[PDB]
């Protein structure tokens, strides 16, 4: 399973099992026993507009 989206820079560490946050409980919550990997990388040059 590959789930892709874009997030705020400071909330990147809410993407982890057993975490609490704004997006962590209202937008995307991971199971505690989740197995897999997470990939995070900046997109200032593309996903940001002047």
């Amino acid at each position: 399973y590959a789930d892709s989206f874009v997030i705020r820079g400071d909330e990147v560490r809410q993407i982890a099992p057993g975490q609490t946050g704004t997006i962590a409980d209202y937008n995307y919550k991971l199971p505690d026993d989740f197995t897999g990997c997470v990939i995070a990388w900046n997109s200032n040059n593309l996903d940001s507009k002047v």
């Binding site: 099992p17 057993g18 975490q19 609490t20 505690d32």
Partner: protein, 49 residues
């Protein structure tokens, strides 16, 4: 009828059983190195992780 302490054996059996049960129940209050001795407190004070 008069002299007591003539039936020490049965009294000892009863006392041993009662004492063992009592200490087994007493063991609940211990901490075992956890935060507290009651599940509800540590459940309501901390998230599962």
């Amino acid at each position: 009828s008069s002299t007591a302490s003539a039936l020490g054996k049965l009294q000892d059996v009863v006392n041993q059983n009662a004492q063992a049960l009592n200490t087994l129940v007493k063991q609940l209050s211990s901490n075992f190195g956890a935060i507290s001795s009651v599940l509800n407190d540590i459940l309501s004070r901390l998230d599962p992780p």
